[PDB]
Amino acid sequence: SRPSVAIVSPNWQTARRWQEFLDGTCNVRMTQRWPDDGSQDDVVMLALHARRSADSIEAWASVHGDRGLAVVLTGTDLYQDIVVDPRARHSLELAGQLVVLQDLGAEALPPALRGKTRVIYQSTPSQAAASKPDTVLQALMVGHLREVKSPQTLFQAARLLAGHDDIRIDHIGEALDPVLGEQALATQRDCPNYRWLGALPHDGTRERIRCAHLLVHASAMEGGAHVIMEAVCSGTPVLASRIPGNVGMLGADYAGYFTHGDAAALAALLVRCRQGQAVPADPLLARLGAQCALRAPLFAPEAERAALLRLVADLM
């Protein structure tokens, strides 16, 4: 009496968020491998992480072709796995529909794959803006220490700013690359205003996003950073590396980009934002705030719910 939908994945994460969106009208179940026990009636498969879920994508195609099959793509899929893992790339060719997370994710793809790609922004409930002090600027960057996140840009910005005792930098992220972890420790040793907080639970990170004056996201590539959505929907504006995955989140006209790898430009934007605290002496910080507020409707849960049900309907 209800269509059976399988979500293949290895409350805020996509598999659970999408299961809750779909739970009203479909029989949804998350599963790690598709041909499982309750598979006999499935009409739709929504597969996350093509590389780890390729066997389940290929199992589906052997039974259905691309009928009812969609694959969701992140930055790891777009710029690493589909140019390196031939089974991962072939999952994209098996898919009926491909999903990217912001309106530039499709330009990373060849024309034959682009023509079956649609955009579905992630969503999160909005959070009321926190009160924040005007005697210091507190910046925050979030992401496990891997080279693709470019934490070395933030390390160098902290050093350039060591003469600015009214600017602070907090840094959340597990030290998955121990060399980058040592550099976090060295930066903290040499720059008292820089703090590496290590691996934090999701709820603590979400609250520190809300409490910071700004989020810095410096990555070399992105499929659509979850933490930029969280910041935008919490009243915390962003300083972002000017890469397609960030522009898709924040907009071609956004005033808060810096050239990727350019630690001097990041530091200078930090000094400018400090100068926005109070009639503010520098208008940039307020401008970033107003622009992010205009981006926030893109991440409303109701928009993603509606887009997901449209996808499932298209696939039935």
Side-chain angles (χ1 to χ4, degrees):
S1 89
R2 306 201 306 165
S4 177
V5 177
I7 303 191
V8 185
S9 89
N11 59 306
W12 48 275
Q13 318 216 241
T14 295
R16 276 212 138 274
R17 195 171 71 252
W18 280 17
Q19 158 173 71
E20 253 155 50
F21 284 155
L22 291 186
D23 189 38
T25 50
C26 313
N27 306 320
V28 202
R29 60 155 199 295
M30 313 186 285
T31 176
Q32 317 183 38
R33 208 258 192 262
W34 165 59
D36 71 46
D37 270 307
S39 299
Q40 67 267 349
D41 282 322
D42 294 340
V43 297
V44 163
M45 166 187 297
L46 309 174
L48 322 170
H49 306 326
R51 188 182 60 75
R52 286 183 55 138
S53 80
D55 70 317
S56 307
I57 290 165
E58 155 195 19
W60 183 269
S62 80
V63 168
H64 296 298
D66 73 10
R67 190 231 286 267
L69 172 62
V71 182
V72 184
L73 306 177
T74 68
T76 303
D77 294 301
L78 285 168
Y79 307 97
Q80 336 205 319
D81 285 345
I82 68 138
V83 259
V84 142
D85 205 74
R87 261 231 293 182
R89 179 188 218 291
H90 190 46
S91 296
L92 272 54
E93 308 176 296
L94 297 177
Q97 289 287 285
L98 299 172
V99 173
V100 291
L101 299 188
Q102 34 74 30
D103 60 1
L104 295 186
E107 302 181 348
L109 293 158
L113 294 182
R114 210 183 293 151
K116 58 172 176 182
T117 303
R118 62 174 81 197
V119 182
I120 304 182
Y121 285 87
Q122 302 204 135
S123 65
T124 187
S126 292
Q127 290 181 116
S131 174
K132 301 165 187 192
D134 61 355
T135 66
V136 71
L137 188 79
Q138 180 73 76
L140 171 70
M141 170 146 134
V142 177
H144 52 40
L145 311 183
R146 284 263 190 241
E147 180 65 12
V148 73
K149 299 280 184 176
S150 296
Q152 284 161 333
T153 312
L154 191 76
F155 304 150
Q156 197 51 38
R159 280 184 196 276
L160 298 165
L161 295 169
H164 290 75
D165 267 6
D166 53 341
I167 305 182
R168 291 161 183 193
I169 298 173
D170 275 1
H171 194 182
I172 290 168
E174 189 174 17
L176 293 179
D177 182 320
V179 175
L180 292 175
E182 296 295 332
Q183 266 180 308
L185 299 177
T187 306
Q188 176 172 273
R189 192 199 49 215
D190 298 333
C191 307
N193 296 137
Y194 168 90
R195 275 199 315 171
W196 175 55
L197 302 184
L200 288 194
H202 165 265
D203 276 8
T205 304
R206 193 155 136 102
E207 176 66 1
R208 291 181 182 276
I209 299 291
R210 191 176 70 88
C211 286
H213 295 96
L214 62 87
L215 172 89
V216 172
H217 203 63
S219 299
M221 68 79 160
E222 270 282 342
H226 199 275
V227 296
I228 294 183
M229 168 182 68
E230 281 174 60
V232 164
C233 300
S234 304
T236 296
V238 179
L239 299 178
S241 52
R242 199 191 286 102
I243 54 156
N246 290 342
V247 178
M249 286 315 267
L250 289 155
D253 69 337
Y254 189 66
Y257 299 120
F258 57 97
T259 304
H260 173 263
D262 191 344
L266 170 57
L269 286 172
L270 286 166
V271 167
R272 285 203 63 186
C273 284
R274 171 54 192 162
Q275 281 305 110
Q277 295 182 279
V279 275
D282 191 322
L284 169 67
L285 177 63
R287 185 50 172 145
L288 298 187
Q291 283 189 308
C292 286
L294 296 171
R295 297 299 284 186
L298 302 165
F299 311 106
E302 310 87 44
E304 180 179 35
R305 180 161 92 260
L308 181 57
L309 284 147
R310 178 83 261 163
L311 176 58
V312 173
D314 287 348
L315 297 168
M316 271 157 94

